[PDB]
């Protein structure tokens, strides 16, 4: 089996990626963030307090036929940005792009916390990490990709964001027309639960490359790119009136700038960031001081290898006995 669905940007800076996904009998259809880095299933729900969702399209349970409680499941998520969300569990029918899971664990919110509440296009995310890290208790569950593996032509996804533009998830096959020159394939750690590799190194626009081991995670669901402080620090350099500011929390520019490309390594190959990837508009509505799109890594304990990075790049998640990871130009 197969299936492929078009990812959109939830707004105009590309602050996050959403993707239509198919839960219940009859279909209830909730737009959810595609998240390599964890490996929970969770929707906004019809037992969402009530006062705490706003706008978004949620799951009701009770009128899916396929819907089953798990009994004295539960499952809470805190993620870095001090966000979080809570609920119970059902298992449910669930459908991307034409490829069809039965039985997937489907974590139903009751508690959101405020950032989920104030933005109304994400209707939950859906984990695409190794299912270690799933917090449903006192059984952990599986991920759609872990539950769909078995069934698909081969036991891959592939993520292609689009800069301002959409882009596309595919299960289980790769395009070979959505990429130019070929696929770079480099190694995975799953010790952390995270697609975990390491980058060869980086150059700052035209300049030199510099060799250098970056360990990092592969996560489509970081807006942005964290590396370590001297390699953030380097490129910030080249933006005339760029600084990094405690008020705002990391690195700002002047909007009047052009900045440059940011190069990583995957293997012997390059991927190749345009400067203006790199850019996420107004520190806040009318300034001309706009906010960074790499920032430094040092206060998460990991680099992340997040939107900015991937959406360059037509992304492999091989998920073969032993995982690795492919990049490939496009
Ligand atoms: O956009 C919607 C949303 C909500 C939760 C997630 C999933 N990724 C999260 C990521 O793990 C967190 N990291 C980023 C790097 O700095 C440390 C904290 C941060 O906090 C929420 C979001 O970014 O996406």
Redesign the pocket.
């Known amino acids: 089996s197969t299936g492929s669905a078009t990812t959109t940007p939830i707004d105009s800076l590309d602050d996050?990626y959403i993707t239509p996904v198919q839960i219940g009998t009859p279909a209830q259809t909730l737009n959810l963030?595609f998240?390599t880095?964890?490996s929970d299933l969770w929707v906004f729900s019809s037992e969402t307090t009530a006062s705490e969702v706003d706008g978004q399209t949620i799951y009701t349970p009770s009128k899916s036929t396929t819907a089953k409680l798990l009994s004295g499941a539960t499952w809470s998520i805190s993620?870095?940005?001090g966000?979080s969300s809570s609920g119970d569990v059902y298992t449910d029918t669930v459908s991307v792009g034409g490829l069809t899971v039965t039985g997937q664990a489907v974590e139903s919110a009751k508690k959101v916390s405020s950032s989920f509440t104030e933005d109304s296009t994400?209707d939950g995310?859906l984990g695409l990490a190794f299912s270690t890290l799933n917090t449903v208790s006192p059984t952990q569950q599986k991920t759609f990709f872990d539950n769909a593996k078995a069934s698909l032509d081969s036991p891959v996804f592939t993520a292609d964001l689009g800069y301002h533009a959409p882009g596309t998830y595919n299960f289980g096959f790769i395009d070979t027309t959505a990429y130019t020159g070929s696929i770079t394939y480099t190694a995975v750690s799953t010790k952390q639960g995270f697609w975990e590799w390491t980058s060869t190194g980086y150059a700052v626009g035209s300049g030199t490359f510099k060799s250098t081991s970056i360990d990092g995670i592969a996560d489509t669901?970081?807006?942005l790119l964290?590396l370590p402080a001297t390699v953030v620090s380097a490129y910030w350099a080249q933006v005339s009136g760029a600084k990094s500011s405690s008020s705002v929390g990391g690195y700002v520019f002047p909007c009047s700038a052009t900045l440059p490309s940011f190069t990583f390594g995957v293997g012997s190959a390059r991927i190749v960031i345009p400067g203006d990837y790199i850019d996420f508009g107004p520190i806040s509505t009318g300034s001309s001081s706009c906010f960074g799109g790499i920032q430094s890594s040092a206060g998460?304990g990991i680099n992340?290898f997040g939107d900015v990075a991937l959406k360059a790049a037509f992304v492999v998640f091989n998920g073969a006995t032993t995982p690795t990871l492919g990049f490939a130009s496009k």
């Open positions: 996050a963030d998240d880095g964890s993620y870095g940005d966000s994400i995310l669901g970081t807006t964290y998460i992340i």
